[PDB]
Design a protein around this ligand. Structure first.
Ligand SMILES: [Cl-]
Ligand SMILES: [Cl-]
Length: 93
């Protein structure tokens, strides 16, 4: 159950309904299957002030390799890696 699963992704807000995001889809999958809910860890780097995040779900870790303009945006990209690497739907129009 070790290691980190990764992809190069960014969250594109106009590709989803304003009120249904990847973080919320991931939370609903955890409720349905009675798993512990997700834990995020987010950091900002001094080189260029961008953010990156890692999410832990069911003892497995997931991360995007790109950096983005806010904590919220980084956290949404982490959620996408978790869902898309597993073939789960993520809310796209
Ligand atoms: Cl959450
Ligand atoms: Cl934002």
């Amino acid at each position: 159950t070790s290691g980190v699963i990764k992809m190069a992704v960014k969250f594109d807000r106009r590709a989803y309904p304003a009120q249904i995001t990847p973080k919320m889809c991931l939370l609903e999958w955890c409720r349905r299957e009675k798993l512990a809910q997700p834990v995020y860890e987010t950091v900002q780097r001094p080189l260029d002030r961008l953010f990156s995040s890692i999410v832990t779900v069911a003892e497995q870790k997931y991360q995007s390799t790109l950096w983005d303009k806010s904590a919220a945006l980084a956290e949404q990209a982490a959620a996408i890696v978790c869902l898309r690497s597993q073939g789960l739907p993520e809310g796209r129009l």
